[PDB]
Amino acid sequence: DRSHFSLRDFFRGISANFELGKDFLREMNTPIHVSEAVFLPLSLCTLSPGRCLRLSPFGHSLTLGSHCEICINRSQVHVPQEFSSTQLSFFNNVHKIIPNKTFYVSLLSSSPSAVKAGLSQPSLLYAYLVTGHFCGTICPIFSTNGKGRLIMHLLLQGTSLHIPETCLKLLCENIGPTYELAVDLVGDAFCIKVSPRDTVYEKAVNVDEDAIYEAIKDLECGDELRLQIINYTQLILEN
Amino acid sequence: MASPEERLLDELNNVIVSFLCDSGSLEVERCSGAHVFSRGSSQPLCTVKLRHGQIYHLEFVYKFLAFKLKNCNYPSSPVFVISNNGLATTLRCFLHEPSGLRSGQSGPCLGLSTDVDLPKNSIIMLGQDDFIKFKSPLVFPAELDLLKSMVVCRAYITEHRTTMQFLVFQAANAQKASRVMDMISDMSQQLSRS
Ligand SMILES: [Zn+2]
């Protein structure tokens, strides 16, 4: 009786009344494998386009935006900000030196004469701003590679961090190609490394120069930031 | 009337309009040409525009079309062609494999995968047994049949990149799905065969 239910019987019964086929389509509502485990380190560039990152100390998983509970409960629209153009956002919030203080603090603390090389790359600020927007207060760190181009290590303060889909989209799409984006964790916490794509690609420029150096006026370094930045620089040197 | 061909074409278009996308306005361009049936066809039964975020029940529609065609003693099996023309992504439903072959015709006939980047002037070609090949390594043997595991295509269309995300849907309430299947079996048993 129930046996012998060929596909033909199914499609015939539906052809009788399309509403039964709609009922069937309605019941098949759950995707099979939304969540995909991922292990560190991970090159974010070489990543599928729409995916959230649910990084946590015990495990590190990657899920899809459509079925990301945290990205769904919160206002899915959230706050669409105009960060679309790298250069636009650079010259938009270089004025906000009262915020973004940690970024300027780290580059200044290094004062290697490569503060010029940090200013030369506007991509850096873009990363910081967006990582600050969607993923809370960041702790910037700047290191010197054999290449004149400085490498950046933005550290994120979090036991379990939820990197949203829109953030990864912005980063990979607007800055991705020009600078290698990667994620790894130092002792205290996870971090996003912004790097130059070897020496194959150098792009964009501007030179405010001393205009910004007179501006920084060597603002005070909070001892909390002082300890964090010092320890993280030491630990980077150990890597 | 020309019901032998016209009526069949109309029914197929109605199927695609009714079951492809569960909700929303479906931008479909129907074809009014007998060349649909002629071998080596370059013209589709229907061309459907693809919108970001919407879910398109591809496999159900495909298997339903194949059933209707085999009922009408049409030998060939359908073929779906999802392509990026630069302006929009289009799903074209050809009843038989077109003439645009693998031999340097446009951007390669990209195969199925979880995520497929679909650049401009590139195509994806879905055939008769591609769905089962795609579902084989993702579900257990009992689940391979469409009655339990359905393939669908979501569109991730952004101005900076367009990507096709192929997914596999199952029923959560297996008991309720069984009840719906019972309804369908009752309807089939009541209707008369040849
Ligand atoms: Zn998310």
Distance, CA of A208 to CA of A192 (rounded, Å): 27
Q: Where are the beta strands (DSSP E) in chain A?
A: 28-31, 36-37, 42-43, 52-55, 60-63, 138-144, 150-156, 161-163, 179-185, 190-196
Give φ, ψ of A20 to 5 degrees.
Answer: -65, -40
SS3 of B87-150: the string is: CCEEEEEECCCCCCCCCCCCEEEECCCCEEECCCCEEEEECCCHHHHHHHHHCCHHHCCCCCCE
Of residues B87, B84, B116, B81, the one with CA closest to residue B99: B81
Kindly give the pairing relationship between strand B107-110 and strand B122-126: parallel
Block residue for tokens 């030196």? A97
Q: What is the DSSP string of B38-59?
A: SSS--S-SEEEE--TT-EE-HH
3-state secondary structure of A148: coil
Distance, CA of A227 to CA of B94 (rounded, Å): 66
Q: Are A147 and A196 in contact (CB under 8 A)?
A: yes
Nearest-CA distance from A130 to chain B in Å?
A: 18
What CA–CA distances, in Å, run from A181 to A18, B57, B136?
49, 35, 34
CA-angle at A155, arms to A150 and A157, nearest 5° = 165
Locate B127 and state its tokens.
């055939």
CA atoms within 13 A on the CB side of A220: 3
Distance, CA of A184 to CA of A193 (rounded, Å): 8
Amino acid present at B59: E
Inter-chain residue contact A13 with B186, CB threshold 8 Å:
yes
Q: In angstroms, what is the resolution?
A: 4.0
3-state secondary structure of A222: coil
Locate A215 and state its tokens.
């501006």
Locate A93 and state its tokens.
């919030």
Alpha carbon A52 to chain centroid, angstroms: 10
Locate B12 and state its tokens.
């197929």
Inter-chain residue contact B184 with A48, CB threshold 8 Å:
no
Domain map (residue ranges) of chain A = 81-237
Distance, CA of A21 to CA of A17 (rounded, Å): 8
Q: Are B156 and A20 in contact (CB under 8 A)?
A: no
Inter-chain residue contact B184 with A20, CB threshold 8 Å:
yes
- State the structure-solving technique: X-ray
